[PDB]
């Protein structure tokens, strides 16, 4: 019954954050370069099909 004679204000929250990095020694034939070139080809194809 006390909630008829009382006012309550409540706030709660949380934030999580992670920043991580990975360096690799590459050339133009390395897997990291090839995957992004493949991504570019796929983007072009999707644009064409629209």
């Amino acid at each position: 019954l006390g909630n008829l004679f009382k006012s309550t204000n409540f706030q709660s929250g949380n934030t999580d954050l992670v920043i991580l990095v990975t360096p690799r020694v590459v050339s133009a034939a390395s897997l990291e370069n090839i995957r992004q070139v493949s991504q570019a080809v796929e983007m072009k194809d999707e644009y064409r099909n629209t």
Binding site: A40, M43, K44, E46, Y47
Partner: protein, 50 residues
């Protein structure tokens, strides 16, 4: 007694650059929005003893 050339013929380089970007977005806003703060009950008294 030898003399230099006016300049040296350099190799020429051709540069081909591709820049591909795609953006997508979705926005929804649905439901019923009610009032969250309404007036409460009131009481009052008044008298003149003398």
């Amino acid at each position: 007694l030898a003399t230099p050339s006016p300049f040296d013929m350099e190799k020429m380089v051709w540069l081909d650059v591709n820049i591909l970007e795609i953006r997508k977005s979705v926005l929804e806003n649905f439901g019923v929005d009610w009032s969250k703060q309404i007036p409460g009950p009131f009481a009052a008294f008044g008298k003149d003893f003398v």
